[PDB]
Symmetry: C2
Subunit: 429 residues, 2 copies
């Protein structure tokens, strides 16, 4: 039911909010001005001009806003009652998808997936193994299979003294942000696209249950482990992100010298052939302009194809029977796969990227060990100094799992500069 | 006439474009993906978390989008025919103002106004004085009173082989971007707000004349020096920029330790008193959260006040008789002035900001002198090396003024990193 999916409800609301009577734009406005989003300006994208996480978020938001606007147009033309009595507009869908896409990278720890694996391995085989017997199975699982999507949900909606609900985003935006509406256990029960990872920690189970019950998400789990169907706009958000990750990593790889210019045309002829102006392409004198020209065309065709795919399986998506992505139903699957493999071989496996990941591991391991050692023995002078350096903000009487997840969130959201400086101080440099 | 002001015309168009038959959102989308806008991620805001030019542009765009949406609502309710037959929406106004505000900092040289003065002084008393007799009075004036607004217009609309019209933005966006629709001469003929500076160089006179004739801007000059009235949405763009420059420089100054916390409340009580929740403010435990809370409130009230002021003088603004800014008609003028003066005394006059400006002067002077010396004698080996290092892109048979303005644009749009590296290479470091 689309009426419940486009909920304007926020945390702490008592009276129901109706479309015909704050707005989805306000979510984007709040995310833009938020400190965690601003902090993305000092966070890199594990590549050797090259995009930072802030620009990637910006570009993803721009693709998601286009996808959502077209999808809202088509749904409003398919469900007249959504605008006749409920008063919804395609700009609403665009705003929801753009706000969800803008914050999709707000909780990811530095150094890419290597940082996530470092946080996981710290609690699996490192100093964090001591907490295994003091936590429940799902809590420990969250600790060992730490992902930045659950951390991003935590950042977007975590209460603090004087700020309940965090950014207080609308429930539609929160639902679109959740790509994996399931708990930390069981680990990958099936081949469904939404079961690859989890989207919320144990400290957010009640809040996401409230969000799902407000949005009317279908309960797909018959056991005691909660799991819901994906929000239909989460498909658009993820498709936008994949389109950017594919076409823009290739642009960045080509412009940085890691990928020769020939592969650009070689893997973009199929994508851009239907709309390329050959005279304009040949008239361009710089490689950067040509690759930008190709990137714009490819993004446009992929956006249109994703909209067509979404409207092809709307009923299946709303029922929860869709087990793959919108980009997986692409006619350009071979070319997309070839581009992804070439990017993996030339960028992600480059020395510079490997070197950086090896440093992240040592920095994150050191910081996590220092924070945990301070947590266990908060009486020594060195531990008091560590607490002052890394957690001067506040202190409270919380549980062990809450403290550990707070440590993980604080370490994940540090800027590369702040993390490196703290690691050097702790290492006496 | 508002119908002509909301023009969808772009460079090279032959058939007229009508609202009821590409869209103002496309301008924002293009600016986001443009290389010059991306380059703002490596450009600082001459302050010692602290905003870069990209985040300032982002925040300004967000304020301008709010202002434009409210102003469009009120104009559509005041002119029913703008939506009944022409089919315009308030989202159009919001998109135009947001696109204009996003690119307002795209042509400014580094090191703030110190860089602009360095470029001016290079041609006034430096090595550039040799070109005074080889150029017209207005051309030389443009060289010596170089501003980043004209350079931003150049960046947004300058033709290149394979790219005619640059980003090919809509004419409404270009009109809203132009804060000073006048030539380089005469220099400040009156006290009008639009006559403080100029908005386009001599190489863009024909293009901006075409833009003004398409938008129906009123010719305010009876002499041979062209000058037009401000576009009504340029007032909103400038008001948004001033609101951010005032409230956010104060936030940055407070958070950086240059401004104590007391002045925050002292100068924000009047602005935020009508909408502040005292319980929420006192419950916050960190200074950053409190100042963010105050900044959001102040931005909201200033936005509403600016909308009210704009609708107060709509007829005067459309006739061209308005000689001041929207922020100049504020009831909070004393508090705004006090905040600006405190920011000037504590941030802009800080050592760190002074030191940086003294370095900009030497870097920009060195780079401009090297480029000019390469231009005059393009036969020596050293000059060929300089041309390869600083201008490898392309070469053409252009006039002296075109070459000099191209040199100025290229130097102004270099990233701080690229500029510093080139200056060190030239200095043999
Ligand atoms: Mg992404
Ligand atoms: Mg500004």
């Amino acid at each position: 039911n689309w009426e419940h999916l486009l909920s304007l409800k926020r945390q702490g609301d008592t009276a129901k909010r109706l479309r015909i009577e704050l707005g989805f734009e306000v979510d984007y406005d709040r995310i833009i001005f938020s400190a965690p989003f601003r902090s993305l300006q000092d966070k890199t994208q594990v590549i050797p001009f090259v995009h930072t996480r802030l620009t990637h978020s910006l570009e993803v938001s721009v693709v998601g806003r286009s996808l959502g606007r077209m999808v809202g147009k088509k749904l409003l033309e398919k469900y007249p009652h959504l605008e006749q009595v409920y008063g919804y507009k395609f700009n609403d869908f665009g705003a929801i998808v753009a706000a969800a896409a803008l914050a999709h990278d707000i909780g990811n720890p530095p150094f890419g997936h290597s940082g996530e694996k470092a946080i996981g391995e710290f609690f699996k085989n490192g100093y964090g193994k001591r907490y295994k017997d003091s936590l429940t199975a799902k809590e420990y699982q969250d600790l060992i299979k730490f992902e930045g999507n659950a951390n991003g949900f935590k950042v977007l909606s975590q209460s603090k003294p004087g700020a309940q609900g965090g950014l207080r985003l609308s429930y539609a935006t929160l639902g679109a942000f959740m790509k994996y509406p399931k708990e930390s256990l069981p680990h990958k029960p099936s081949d469904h696209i939404a079961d690859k990872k989890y989207g919320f920690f144990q400290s957010e189970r009640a809040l996401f249950e409230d969000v799902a019950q407000e949005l009317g998400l279908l309960k797909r789990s018959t056991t005691d482990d909660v799991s819901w169907s994906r929000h239909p706009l989460a498909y658009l958000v993820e498709a936008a992100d994949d389109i950017c990750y594919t076409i823009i990593d290739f642009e960045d790889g080509i412009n940085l010298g890691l990928i020769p210019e020939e592969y650009a045309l070689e893997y973009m002829v199929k994508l851009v052939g239907q709309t390329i102006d050959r005279n304009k392409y040949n008239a361009l004198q710089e490689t950067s302009d040509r690759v930008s020209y190709l990137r714009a065309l490819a993004i446009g065709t992929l956006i249109n194809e994703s909209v067509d795919t979404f409207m092809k399986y709307e009923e299946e998506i709303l029922a929860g029977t869709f087990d793959q992505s919108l980009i997986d139903k692409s006619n350009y699957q071979a070319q997309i796969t070839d581009i992804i493999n070439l990017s993996i071989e030339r960028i992600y496996n480059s020395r510079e990227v490997i070197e950086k990941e090896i440093a992240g591991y040592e920095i994150l391991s050191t910081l996590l060990e220092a924070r945990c050692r301070a947590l266990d023995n908060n009486d020594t002078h060195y531990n008091q100094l560590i607490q002052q350096l890394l957690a001067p903000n506040d202190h409270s009487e919380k549980s062990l799992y809450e403290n550990l997840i707070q440590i993980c969130a604080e370490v994940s959201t540090m800027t590369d500069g702040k993390a490196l400086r703290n690691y050097k101080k702790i290492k006496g440099l």
